[PDB]
Design a protein around this ligand. Structure first.
Ligand SMILES: Nc1ncnc2c1ncn2[C@@H]1O[C@H](COP(=O)(O)OP(=O)(O)CP(=O)(O)O)[C@@H](O)[C@H]1O
Ligand SMILES: [Mg+2]
Length: 365
């Protein structure tokens, strides 16, 4: 029964100051190939940028938070998760004995597998290597990083990775059916933050996305700006709607920081105009209805880290989105818990159009 001591950007068993101290002591950024660091501030939001070398090349990773410490931990752990997610032969099986998951789009039988755990049944289940590692080039569709997460404890990572999967499922639902989600109305500090970021662009608008998992809220933030590359989107997912909002706003700040450095990002042909971009994306700029953040029920109340993991897993398993699978990606040398979470029927349409998942005929209205 581990206590949740921090629940601003995410649910953590440690304060960010302790974690930063711990990242530095263990020299994680150096060990993972960080070669350059930059510090930005987008309105009031610290953004951290990392340049990382590996055998696969040179990558830019970003971190952010409400505080400079949190931004620096976020950037460091983002680098760690990516390093951990690189293909590793030590844990690939080719003649696997047990249950296997073969995604819909696989026309042919996959040859490389990694063993995970089904989180409902606790039974072993094999996942394709292309569904675990990044980058992986051998298979039918591109590798990606959805569901991937690092933490101080494996529970932190499962929570964060699972919420990421729900987040991209909701966004995929919105895009595929071109749903117009309602505007989300917020107060106090969150509103002041929205206002403060808005001063950086033209408009910052909040949306409550349809969520296919009960007790999890998904929030989108969309911008309007006179420069087109500063019209970005941010997303957050949490049983706590205030966290969902914060993470969406933080992701906008991250996006704005990347655009201003001209960093090409799948992580954050002929030049478009701001007004045409609005018209191509009217579902985001013409919301259907309004929601008050106060009228949202706190279904899952956040006590202990194990109980919260258990609860979110249950809710996902109940949603009609297939199996909830965890694959361990902890490196031997750095003792940093990293997982890949798969929800076998969760949509990943926004990443690849062939990753449709369990899609209904008519959208949930
Ligand atoms: N206080 C903390 N302690 C340990 N790990 C943390 C942490 N805060 C963030 N992380 C980890 O660092 C990475 C960056 O997380 P962040 O909070 O910035 O959201 P995110 O990066 O998942 C959005 P995206 O997947 O699109 O890049 C994640 O693996 C996250 O779990
Ligand atoms: Mg992530």
């Amino acid at each position: 029964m581990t206590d949740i001591v921090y629940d601003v950007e995410g649910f953590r068993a440690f304060l960010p100051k302790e974690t930063l101290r711990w990242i530095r002591h263990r020299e994680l950024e150096r060990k993972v190939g960080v070669v350059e660091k930059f510090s930005d501030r987008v309105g009031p939001i610290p953004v951290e940028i990392r340049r990382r070398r590996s055998q696969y090349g040179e990558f830019y990773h970003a971190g952010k938070g409400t505080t400079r410490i949190q931004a620096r931990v976020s950037a460091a752990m983002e680098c760690v998760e990516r390093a951990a997610a690189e293909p590793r032969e030590e844990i690939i099986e080719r003649g696997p004995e047990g249950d296997k998951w073969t995604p819909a789009w696989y026309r042919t039988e996959p040859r490389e597998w990694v063993e995970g755990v089904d989180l409902t049944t606790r039974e072993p289940v094999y996942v394709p290597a292309n569904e675990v590692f990044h980058p992986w080039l051998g298979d039918a569709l591109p590798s990606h990083t959805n569901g991937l997460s690092a933490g101080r404890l494996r529970e932190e990572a499962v929570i964060q990775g699972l919420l990421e999967v729900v987040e991209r499922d909701s966004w995929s639902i919105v895009e595929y059916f071109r749903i117009h989600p309602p505007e989300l109305e917020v107060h106090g500090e969150l509103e002041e933050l929205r206002r403060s970021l808005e001063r950086e662009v033209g408009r910052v608008e909040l949306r409550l996305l349809p969520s296919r998992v009960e007790g999890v809220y998904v929030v989108g933030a969309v911008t309007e700006a006179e420069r087109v590359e500063e019209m970005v989107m941010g997303f957050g997912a949490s049983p706590d709607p205030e966290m969902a909002v914060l993470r969406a706003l933080l992701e906008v700040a991250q996006g704005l920081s990347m655009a201003r450095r001209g960093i090409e990002s799948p992580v954050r042909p002929g030049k478009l105009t701001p007004e045409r971009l609005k018209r191509l994306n009217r579902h985001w700029f013409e919301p259907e209805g309004t929601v008050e953040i106060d009228d949202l029920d706190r279904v899952i109340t956040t006590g202990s880290l194990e109980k919260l993991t258990e609860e979110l897993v249950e809710r996902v398993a109940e949603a009609g989105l297939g199996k909830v699978i965890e694959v361990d990606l902890t490196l031997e040398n750095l003792d940093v818990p990293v997982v890949r979470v798969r929800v076998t029927g969760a949509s990943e349409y926004v990443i690849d159009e062939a990753r449709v998942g369990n899609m209904p005929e008519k959208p949930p209205g």
